[PDB]
Amino acid sequence: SPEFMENFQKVEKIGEGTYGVVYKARNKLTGEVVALKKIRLDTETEGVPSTAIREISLLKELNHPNIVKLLDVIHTENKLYLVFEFLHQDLKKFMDASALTGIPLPLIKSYLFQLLQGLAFCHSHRVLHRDLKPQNLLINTEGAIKLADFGLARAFGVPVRTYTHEVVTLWYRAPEILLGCKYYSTAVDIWSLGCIFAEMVTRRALFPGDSEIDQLFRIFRTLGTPDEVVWPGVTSMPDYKPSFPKWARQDFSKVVPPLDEDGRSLLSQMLHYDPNKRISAKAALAHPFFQDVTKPVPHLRL
Numbered sequence: 001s002p003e004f005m006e007n008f009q010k011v012e013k014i015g016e017g018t019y020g021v022v023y024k025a026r027n028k029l030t031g032e033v034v035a036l037k038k039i040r041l042d043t044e045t046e047g048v049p050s051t052a053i054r055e056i057s058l059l060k061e062l063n064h065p066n067i068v069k070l071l072d073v074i075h076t077e078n079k080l081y082l083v084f085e086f087l088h089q090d091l092k093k094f095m096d097a098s099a100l101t102g103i104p105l106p107l108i109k110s111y112l113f114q115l116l117q118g119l120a121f122c123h124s125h126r127v128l129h130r131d132l133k134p135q136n137l138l139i140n141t142e143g144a145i146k147l148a149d150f151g152l153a154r155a156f157g158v159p160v161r162t163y164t165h166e167v168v169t170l171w172y173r174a175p176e177i178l179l180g181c182k183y184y185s186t187a188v189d190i191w192s193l194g195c196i197f198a199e200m201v202t203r204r205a206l207f208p209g210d211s212e213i214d215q216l217f218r219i220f221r222t223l224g225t226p227d228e229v230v231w232p233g234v235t236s237m238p239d240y241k242p243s244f245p246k247w248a249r250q251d252f253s254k255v256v257p258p259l260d261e262d263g264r265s266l267l268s269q270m271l272h273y274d275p276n277k278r279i280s281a282k283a284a285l286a287h288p289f290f291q292d293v294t295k296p297v298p299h300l301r302l
């Protein structure tokens with residue numbers, strides 16, 4: 001049954017992502033509240049890159065309890081309206097709301113666990129997120145959290161425009177990307193999630209840089225400047241410069257004080273320099289940190 005924009009009552013703008021703005025809408029025909037992501041695509045060179053649509057089709061294929069539910073796709077001349085399930089809020093706004101007490105360990109541990117489940121599902125389906133941050137992770141009242149606002153590959157890039165203020169996307173960006181390697185892996189999402197793990201425990205972003213080189217130095221100041229020992233092939237990296245300052249690695253009892261050995265074990269495995277040593281989503285799930293994992297309800301509010 002065909003859906004149209006005239007079917008949907010807009011109620012309010014719930015935020016803006018990388019590729020448009022997202023609206024809280026009310027399907028007048030069901031009374032059901034949904035989220036609409038508007039997408040102005042550019043039939044520029046006619047679109048249809050054939051790399052772009054191939055990846056997007058892998059995205060629509062994904063059905064998992066920890067990936068936001070795409071209900072319908074509405075085409076109108078030069079526009080695309082993505083109909084999503086409506087969800088309560090994002091992880092960033094949640095972390096801000098309770099930055100005064102922190103998120104209880106069981107809820108941190110639960111969110112982390114579900115995110116690894118969602119990523120593990122993506123990674124076995126040849127999908128990467130590429131832009132994992134608290135902003136674009138969505139929670140509900142059940143106690144669930146879901147991946148949203150996926151990134152797109154190959155530099156540019158599917159035929160859409162963005163309209164975005166300067167990134168804070170750098171904060172969660174894996175080092176191999178910051179040193180310019182051409183082919184990266186699923187390990188880039190593990191890094192980002194690892195950073196988010198730390199932020200949930202400390203109530204603050206691990207590596208808040210204002211530029212690519214500033215981002216690398218913040219990583220270096222904390223985990224130490226990597227060499228060929230810790231990371232084979234690092235010195236030959238396209239954007240590696242031997243002029244890099246040498247920093248000694250800090251210890252985790254100071255970087256993430258409330259973490260016990262199991263959390264630090266896992267965090268260090270997620271924050272490994274070398275992508276070929278960095279723990280996978282599927283393997284992170286089997287980690288003794290998640291031995292007593294539960295599904296707590298979030299203490300929610302506006």
Ligand SMILES: O=S(=O)(O)c1cccc2cccc(Nc3ccccc3)c12
Nearest residue numbers: 039041053056060073075080082158159
């Ligand atoms: O494949 S669709 O399901 O349409 C789709 C769904 C969700 C997001 C999309 C983003 C760009 C292009 C699409 N395809 C497209 C193809 C031809 C014309 C216009 C858009 C997207």
Ligand SMILES: O=S(=O)(O)c1cccc2cccc(Nc3ccccc3)c12
Nearest residue numbers: 019056059060068070148149150152158
């Ligand atoms: O919105 S997301 O939350 O990433 C998303 C979530 C779930 C399924 C999706 C399917 C196709 C495109 C998406 N986003 C997309 C990315 C780039 C351009 C156009 C659409 C999907």
